[PDB]
Amino acid sequence: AELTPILPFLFLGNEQDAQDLDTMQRLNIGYVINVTTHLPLYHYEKGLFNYKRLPATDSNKQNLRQYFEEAFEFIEEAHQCGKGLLIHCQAGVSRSATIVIAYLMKHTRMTMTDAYKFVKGKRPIISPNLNFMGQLLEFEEDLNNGVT
Ligand SMILES: CC(C)(C)C(=O)CSc1ncc2ccc3ccc(Cl)cc3c2n1
């Protein structure tokens, strides 16, 4: 069990981390983003959290940019009402860390490199995915040019 707090309201974890019900309620988490196609929404039937599923796979062809804006608003929703958000996928946190890094670029105004350094400092194990890196690099281009 290990929920990594990126921001006071934004938490990063894997499949096993999302199953620790006691820790999630201790940290005042009320929102969960599940970035998998096959994993269940843990503790859904208990009616404690608001869920959002980004149906993605951990492949070199998966497009995560399409899920960026939807995830940012769910995070803002958790932020604007004083609750924490947990975003998770599987062991390598490749998918979920990509979304978190994207959020830090758009809203916290950090650069792509600095955002990775920020998350990597708090979450030491992140599996590599050149496809997601390319999408984050292309995403930084659009932010600097005023396209998104
Ligand atoms: C995208 C994701 C977080 C899923 C990932 O690929 C983690 S693995 C890794 N390993 C070595 C690196 C060396 C420089 C670097 C500069 C920028 C960015 Cl975003 C990543 C790296 C980098 N990332």
Short mmCIF file of all heavy atoms in Angstrom, two decimals, residues 10-33:
data_model
loop_
_atom_site.label_atom_id
_atom_site.label_comp_id
_atom_site.label_asym_id
_atom_site.label_seq_id
_atom_site.Cartn_x
_atom_site.Cartn_y
_atom_site.Cartn_z
N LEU A 10 -3.80 15.64 -5.22
CA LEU A 10 -3.59 14.74 -6.35
C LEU A 10 -2.67 13.61 -5.93
O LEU A 10 -1.53 13.86 -5.52
CB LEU A 10 -3.02 15.50 -7.55
CG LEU A 10 -2.84 14.72 -8.86
CD1 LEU A 10 -4.16 14.15 -9.33
CD2 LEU A 10 -2.24 15.62 -9.92
N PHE A 11 -3.15 12.37 -6.04
CA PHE A 11 -2.42 11.20 -5.59
C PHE A 11 -2.22 10.23 -6.75
O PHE A 11 -3.10 10.07 -7.60
CB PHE A 11 -3.14 10.50 -4.44
CG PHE A 11 -3.26 11.33 -3.19
CD1 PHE A 11 -4.25 12.29 -3.07
CD2 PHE A 11 -2.36 11.17 -2.15
CE1 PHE A 11 -4.36 13.06 -1.92
CE2 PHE A 11 -2.46 11.94 -1.00
CZ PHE A 11 -3.46 12.88 -0.89
N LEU A 12 -1.05 9.59 -6.77
CA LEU A 12 -0.67 8.66 -7.83
C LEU A 12 -0.40 7.29 -7.23
O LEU A 12 0.23 7.18 -6.17
CB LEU A 12 0.57 9.18 -8.57
CG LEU A 12 1.20 8.32 -9.67
CD1 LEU A 12 0.25 8.18 -10.84
CD2 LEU A 12 2.52 8.92 -10.13
N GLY A 13 -0.85 6.24 -7.91
CA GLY A 13 -0.68 4.90 -7.41
C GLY A 13 -0.89 3.87 -8.50
O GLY A 13 -1.16 4.21 -9.66
N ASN A 14 -0.75 2.60 -8.12
CA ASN A 14 -0.96 1.49 -9.04
C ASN A 14 -2.21 0.70 -8.64
O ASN A 14 -3.04 1.17 -7.84
CB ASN A 14 0.29 0.59 -9.08
CG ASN A 14 0.72 0.10 -7.71
OD1 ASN A 14 -0.10 -0.19 -6.85
ND2 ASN A 14 2.03 0.02 -7.51
N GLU A 15 -2.36 -0.49 -9.22
CA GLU A 15 -3.55 -1.31 -9.00
C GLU A 15 -3.71 -1.67 -7.53
O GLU A 15 -4.82 -1.58 -6.97
CB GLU A 15 -3.46 -2.57 -9.86
CG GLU A 15 -2.04 -3.10 -10.01
CD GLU A 15 -1.91 -4.13 -11.11
OE1 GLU A 15 -2.91 -4.79 -11.43
OE2 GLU A 15 -0.79 -4.27 -11.65
N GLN A 16 -2.62 -2.08 -6.88
CA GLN A 16 -2.69 -2.46 -5.47
C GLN A 16 -2.96 -1.26 -4.57
O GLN A 16 -3.62 -1.39 -3.54
CB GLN A 16 -1.40 -3.14 -5.03
CG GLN A 16 -1.15 -4.51 -5.65
CD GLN A 16 0.09 -5.17 -5.09
OE1 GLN A 16 0.78 -4.61 -4.24
NE2 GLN A 16 0.39 -6.38 -5.57
N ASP A 17 -2.45 -0.08 -4.95
CA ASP A 17 -2.65 1.11 -4.14
C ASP A 17 -4.11 1.53 -4.08
O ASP A 17 -4.58 2.03 -3.05
CB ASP A 17 -1.79 2.25 -4.70
CG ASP A 17 -0.32 1.92 -4.71
OD1 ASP A 17 0.14 1.22 -3.78
OD2 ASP A 17 0.39 2.37 -5.63
N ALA A 18 -4.85 1.32 -5.17
CA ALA A 18 -6.25 1.74 -5.21
C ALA A 18 -7.17 0.86 -4.38
O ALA A 18 -8.34 1.21 -4.21
CB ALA A 18 -6.74 1.77 -6.66
N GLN A 19 -6.67 -0.26 -3.86
CA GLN A 19 -7.47 -1.18 -3.07
C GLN A 19 -7.36 -0.95 -1.57
O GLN A 19 -8.01 -1.66 -0.80
CB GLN A 19 -7.08 -2.62 -3.41
CG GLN A 19 -7.68 -3.10 -4.72
CD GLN A 19 -7.00 -4.34 -5.27
OE1 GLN A 19 -7.23 -5.45 -4.79
NE2 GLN A 19 -6.16 -4.16 -6.27
N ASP A 20 -6.56 0.03 -1.13
CA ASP A 20 -6.43 0.33 0.29
C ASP A 20 -7.52 1.34 0.65
O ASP A 20 -7.33 2.55 0.55
CB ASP A 20 -5.03 0.86 0.60
CG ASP A 20 -4.75 0.92 2.09
OD1 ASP A 20 -5.64 0.54 2.89
OD2 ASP A 20 -3.64 1.34 2.47
N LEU A 21 -8.67 0.82 1.07
CA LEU A 21 -9.82 1.67 1.36
C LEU A 21 -9.56 2.56 2.57
O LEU A 21 -9.98 3.72 2.59
CB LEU A 21 -11.07 0.82 1.58
CG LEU A 21 -12.34 1.56 2.00
CD1 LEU A 21 -12.75 2.58 0.95
CD2 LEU A 21 -13.47 0.59 2.28
N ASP A 22 -8.89 2.02 3.59
CA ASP A 22 -8.66 2.79 4.81
C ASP A 22 -7.78 4.00 4.55
O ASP A 22 -8.06 5.10 5.03
CB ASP A 22 -8.04 1.90 5.88
CG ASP A 22 -8.99 0.83 6.38
OD1 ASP A 22 -10.22 1.00 6.22
OD2 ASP A 22 -8.52 -0.18 6.94
N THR A 23 -6.70 3.82 3.78
CA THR A 23 -5.78 4.92 3.50
C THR A 23 -6.45 6.00 2.65
O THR A 23 -6.22 7.19 2.87
CB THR A 23 -4.53 4.39 2.81
OG1 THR A 23 -3.83 3.50 3.69
CG2 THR A 23 -3.60 5.53 2.43
N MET A 24 -7.29 5.60 1.68
CA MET A 24 -7.94 6.58 0.82
C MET A 24 -8.86 7.49 1.62
O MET A 24 -8.92 8.70 1.37
CB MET A 24 -8.72 5.88 -0.29
CG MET A 24 -7.87 5.14 -1.30
SD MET A 24 -8.86 4.56 -2.68
CE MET A 24 -9.56 6.10 -3.25
N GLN A 25 -9.60 6.94 2.59
CA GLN A 25 -10.47 7.77 3.41
C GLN A 25 -9.68 8.61 4.40
O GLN A 25 -10.12 9.70 4.77
CB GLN A 25 -11.50 6.90 4.13
CG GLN A 25 -12.52 6.26 3.20
CD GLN A 25 -13.53 5.39 3.93
OE1 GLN A 25 -13.17 4.40 4.56
NE2 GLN A 25 -14.80 5.77 3.85
N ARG A 26 -8.52 8.11 4.85
CA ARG A 26 -7.68 8.91 5.73
C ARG A 26 -7.18 10.17 5.02
O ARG A 26 -7.07 11.24 5.63
CB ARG A 26 -6.49 8.08 6.22
CG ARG A 26 -5.55 8.86 7.13
CD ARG A 26 -4.37 8.01 7.58
NE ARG A 26 -3.54 7.60 6.45
CZ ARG A 26 -2.54 8.33 5.97
NH1 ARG A 26 -2.25 9.50 6.52
NH2 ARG A 26 -1.83 7.89 4.93
N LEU A 27 -6.87 10.05 3.73
CA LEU A 27 -6.34 11.16 2.94
C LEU A 27 -7.43 12.02 2.32
O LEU A 27 -7.12 12.92 1.53
CB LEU A 27 -5.41 10.63 1.85
CG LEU A 27 -4.16 9.90 2.34
CD1 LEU A 27 -3.44 9.22 1.19
CD2 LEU A 27 -3.23 10.85 3.08
N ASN A 28 -8.70 11.76 2.63
CA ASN A 28 -9.83 12.56 2.15
C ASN A 28 -9.93 12.53 0.62
O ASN A 28 -10.11 13.56 -0.03
CB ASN A 28 -9.75 14.00 2.67
CG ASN A 28 -11.05 14.76 2.48
OD1 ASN A 28 -12.13 14.19 2.52
ND2 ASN A 28 -10.93 16.07 2.26
N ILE A 29 -9.79 11.34 0.04
CA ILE A 29 -9.93 11.17 -1.40
C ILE A 29 -11.39 10.84 -1.71
O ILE A 29 -11.99 9.97 -1.07
CB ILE A 29 -8.99 10.07 -1.91
CG1 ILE A 29 -7.53 10.49 -1.74
CG2 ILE A 29 -9.27 9.78 -3.38
CD1 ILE A 29 -6.53 9.42 -2.11
N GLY A 30 -11.95 11.55 -2.68
CA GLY A 30 -13.33 11.33 -3.06
C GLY A 30 -13.49 11.09 -4.55
O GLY A 30 -14.59 10.82 -5.03
N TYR A 31 -12.39 11.20 -5.29
CA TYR A 31 -12.40 11.05 -6.73
C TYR A 31 -11.31 10.06 -7.14
O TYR A 31 -10.21 10.07 -6.58
CB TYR A 31 -12.18 12.39 -7.44
CG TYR A 31 -13.33 13.36 -7.27
CD1 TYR A 31 -13.53 14.03 -6.06
CD2 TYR A 31 -14.22 13.60 -8.30
CE1 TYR A 31 -14.58 14.91 -5.90
CE2 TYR A 31 -15.28 14.48 -8.15
CZ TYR A 31 -15.45 15.13 -6.94
OH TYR A 31 -16.50 16.01 -6.79
N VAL A 32 -11.63 9.20 -8.10
CA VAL A 32 -10.72 8.16 -8.58
C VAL A 32 -10.75 8.15 -10.10
O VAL A 32 -11.83 8.16 -10.70
CB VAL A 32 -11.09 6.78 -8.02
CG1 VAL A 32 -10.20 5.71 -8.64
CG2 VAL A 32 -10.96 6.76 -6.51
N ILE A 33 -9.57 8.12 -10.71
CA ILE A 33 -9.43 7.97 -12.16
C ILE A 33 -8.73 6.64 -12.42
O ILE A 33 -7.58 6.44 -11.99
CB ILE A 33 -8.65 9.13 -12.79
CG1 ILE A 33 -9.45 10.44 -12.65
CG2 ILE A 33 -8.36 8.85 -14.25
CD1 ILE A 33 -8.78 11.63 -13.29
#
